[PDB]
Amino acid sequence: VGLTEEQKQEIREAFDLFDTDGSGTIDAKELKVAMRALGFEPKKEEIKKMISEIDKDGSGTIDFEEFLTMMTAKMGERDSREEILKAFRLFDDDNSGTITIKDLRRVAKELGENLTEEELQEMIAEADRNDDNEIDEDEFIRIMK
Amino acid sequence: IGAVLKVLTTGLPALISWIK
Ligand SMILES: [Ca+2]
Ligand SMILES: [Ca+2]
Ligand SMILES: [Ca+2]
Ligand SMILES: [Ca+2]
């Protein structure tokens, strides 16, 4: 639940890696060279905005503590995701990848509840948002969170 | 486990008994 020691040290080493001059702080130029090596190919305007969000003391640079606070909150997010998705997969009855009207018919049975096909499609359409009559991982995560 | 239990035990019957 809280950062592991192993994660604390990984974040440090990732910090020291991004900090190429050893300044103690990640500047806007180091952030973009790090975001590319992370695959990314970001735009100046985004880098700036990253900087402004992670920075807390107006330096326009990221020190270790600002980086740690950010990484802490990302990993936190990533683990709440992985946990909502353990449940998703309970509701993905046939392990298809998305919760469909078939999955909910079956769930409904397995709870001894007699809900109509119409009663169930409403559900889908509330949580649905790309108009495919399915509930995918992001839709589920969303209607939980 | 706390997530999931709280969905089933409370969240699901509430939602069900609504559509009813
Ligand atoms: Ca630096
Ligand atoms: Ca700063
Ligand atoms: Ca399914
Ligand atoms: Ca969908």
Automatic annotation (TrEMBL), chain A:
PROSITE patterns assigned: EF_HAND_1, EF_HAND_2
Any one GO cellular component localisation term in the record: centriole
Function of the protein: This calcium-binding protein is found in the basal body complexes (the functional homolog of the centrosome in animal cell). In mitotic cells it is specifically associated with the poles of the mitotic spindles at the sites of the duplicated basal body complexes.
Residue stretches making up the EF-hand domain: 6-41, 42-77, 79-114, 115-145
Taxonomy, superkingdom: Eukaryota
Family per similarity comment: Belongs to the centrin family.
InterPro entries named among the record's database cross-references: CALM/Myosin/TropC-like (IPR050230), EF-hand-dom_pair (IPR011992), EF_Hand_1_Ca_BS (IPR018247), EF_hand_dom (IPR002048)
The keyword Transcription regulation appears for this protein: no
PANTHER family attached to this UniProt entry: EF-HAND SUPERFAMILY PROTEIN, MYOSIN LIGHT CHAIN 1, 3
Organism: Chlamydomonas reinhardtii (Chlamydomonas smithii)
Name this protein carries in UniProt: Caltractin
Record's keyword annotation contains Transmembrane: no
GO molecular function, one term: calcium ion binding
Record key words, sorted: Calcium, Cell cycle, Cell division, Metal-binding, Mitosis, Repeat
SUPFAM superfamilies linked: EF-hand
SMART domains: EFh
One of the GO BP terms on file: microtubule cytoskeleton organization
